[PDB]
Design an enzyme around this catalytic site. Structure first.
Site, short mmCIF file in Angstrom:
data_model
loop_
_atom_site.label_atom_id
_atom_site.label_comp_id
_atom_site.label_asym_id
_atom_site.label_seq_id
_atom_site.Cartn_x
_atom_site.Cartn_y
_atom_site.Cartn_z
N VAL A 1 -121.57 -7.61 -2.53
CA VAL A 1 -121.37 -6.32 -2.95
C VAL A 1 -121.35 -5.71 -1.05
O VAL A 1 -122.71 -5.41 -1.36
CB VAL A 1 -121.04 -6.37 -3.49
CG1 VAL A 1 -120.73 -4.20 -3.90
CG2 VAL A 1 -120.54 -6.25 -4.86
N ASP A 2 -120.91 -5.42 -0.18
CA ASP A 2 -121.72 -5.29 1.11
C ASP A 2 -121.59 -3.66 1.11
O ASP A 2 -122.03 -2.38 1.43
CB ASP A 2 -121.58 -5.77 2.43
CG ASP A 2 -122.87 -6.13 2.15
OD1 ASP A 2 -124.26 -5.63 2.27
OD2 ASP A 2 -123.19 -7.52 3.34
N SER A 3 -120.20 -3.63 0.48
CA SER A 3 -119.84 -1.06 0.49
C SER A 3 -119.00 -1.14 -1.13
O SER A 3 -117.71 -1.63 -1.43
CB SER A 3 -118.91 -1.50 1.36
OG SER A 3 -117.82 -0.27 1.02
#
Ligand SMILES: [Ba+2]
Ligand SMILES: [Ba+2]
Ligand SMILES: [Ba+2]
Ligand SMILES: [Ba+2]
Ligand SMILES: [Cl-]
Ligand SMILES: [Cl-]
Ligand SMILES: [Cl-]
Ligand SMILES: [Cl-]
Ligand SMILES: [Mg+2]
Ligand SMILES: [Mg+2]
Ligand SMILES: [Mg+2]
Ligand SMILES: [Mg+2]
Lengths: 175, 175, 184, 184
Positions: free
Chosen positions: C109-111
């Site tokens: 989950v990078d954003s």
């Protein structure tokens, strides 16, 4: 900070001459509704040209089907091939069908040839091209129906943008 | 109502032999991370093969980039050209790059040739193909790396579906 | 692995974690009477999730859970995104997912906002259920964590390569999850 | 026109209606202080809206309204759609539309649920406003009518061709809106 280059009536006048010239060239093909001239509209910049040219082609009694393609430029790694990433491809098969690529202006010869290679992979009966604005080199060999000739200039209006703005203008202007 | 045709260890055993054979063929090319072997995964059916083959290629010290393409069949108007509508195209340019089309099984020679023509339009350094399941005619000329040979059969599992079901099975089965 | 400073999670460690997660998933959906004709849909977000999807689907097969797989691919926008995290869908699902159970498959989950957008996107297809599975749970406060349902490996913040995940489109093919050495 | 039983609305009639609609639109968004940098976005649903979009944009230019144009294209699903009207996005917008005013451009509302889905789709991009403009308003009860904001020509139910709209992909190029003769 923009000056008018071509008015709507001029663009229309030129497109209508183009439509008759197209109509007489494809007479020898006996086009029908089951075998029409396919207009391949290259988004976004061609959409207003395509809409007007189609109806001029209707004036000539040319049967028309309308396809759309949309492609995105690569950030890196394109040198000699004009590769673009296809986002939208034709809804209908074009095998053994007559295609007319509808461009507003030839920004990149090599990218035009790539799109031509992409369509040629689809085994069409004929591939030809109609470019709204033609600035006169040796890549005129790629353009069959140049509608209107103009000098080297950054243009807007009539579907064509500067930074997504101004596609909606009736006349073609320069900056 | 399904019988096992190939188990995971067999598929793996075959894919690993294929990976070494690939690795030794591309030795003469001096592949690097800036010039790798691009795996072109044809969705959906190839995704599990691609995932396992990539890691086997890592075992061989082959550098790998992974591209995905997804295409939809036309309802009518395709006879001799294998035209499919492209829905997803490669994120990276492949100009002058080494491409390996990853298929699970060659359902349609002509459709395979179309995809090959589509990639060839992108001016790659080389185009080659690796098909998980190979049933042995004269369109073997299109398949470079057939991993495992099988008799004429409708197969499932290992990414391959019947009606979108059963892609998740570890072993390849027949119906 | 030459481009790896540390090794973060090994192939064998990842599988074991994913097998455990698949059994947790199979317990949670037992009540839902999943059939072949009403399975759990795996939403593989391309590209990073694809190796993880291929293995997780086979661990779900071990658990006896019927699966289907759909892929989506979205490109980021150059500008004009702040609160919404919207992305341009380049590939939408091939099957309708109306009244189906969907699991969004993610590597990291990078954003959180873009994950929220993907969900809003998916929730517009009126699924029966929507959950998310994230292979690498990196440090995050309550905002992110309420989005992730099945974190596989809880992990410190680092630049990961391998197991489908990339650096400059390279290193997805690595069997282990690695930390990229500073001198890339 | 040989394939036309009746002629429903002529080119000249359509333009006059669209000019009137564009002035209604320009009055309604005067308060919103539309700029070149914050314009009204025209969402052309392909293919049927494209001629209508090209003319409506130029009528908006007459009204002095700044425009941008985005295109979407969606394919219908074979099955599994009942309540949701979902469609497979094949082309999403090129610009983010976060906090922008969007007008969905339609030729006809042929499925209220799918129109609802398109809106849910668009509403997930968190626009500043979302309205719809429909060229042909066909008979409909309150369910549909609450979806359409700017109906251009109110029209009886018939099979239309021309002005971008098709029969078997044919007849989009016609200048007038026609009724297809039974013997197609
Ligand atoms: Ba153009
Ligand atoms: Ba296949
Ligand atoms: Ba991801
Ligand atoms: Ba429509
Ligand atoms: Cl002037
Ligand atoms: Cl001229
Ligand atoms: Cl068996
Ligand atoms: Cl074999
Ligand atoms: Mg431009
Ligand atoms: Mg299949
Ligand atoms: Mg990445
Ligand atoms: Mg239609």
């Amino acid at each position: 900070s923009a000056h008018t280059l071509v008015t709507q009536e001029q663009v229309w006048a030129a497109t209508a001459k183009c439509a008759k010239k197209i109509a007489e060239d494809y007479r020898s093909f006996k086009l029908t509704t089951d075998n029409p001239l396919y207009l391949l509209c290259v988004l976004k910049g061609s959409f207003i040209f395509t809409a007007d040219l189609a109806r001029f082609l209707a004036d000539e009694g040319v049967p028309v089907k309308v396809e759309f393609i949309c492609a995105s430029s690569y950030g890196t790694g394109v040198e000699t091939s004009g590769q673009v990433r296809m986002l939208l491809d034709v809804r209908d098969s074009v095998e053994n069908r007559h295609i007319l690529i509808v461009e507003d202006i030839v920004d990149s010869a090599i990218t035009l040839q790539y799109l031509m290679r992409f369509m040629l992979a689809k085994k069409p009966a004929s591939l030809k091209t109609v470019v709204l604005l033609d600035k006169p080199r040796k890549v005129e060999v790629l353009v069959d129906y140049p509608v209107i000739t103009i000098p080297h200039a950054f243009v807007i209006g009539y579907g064509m943008d500067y930074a997504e703005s101004y596609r909606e203008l009736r006349d073609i202007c320069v900056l």
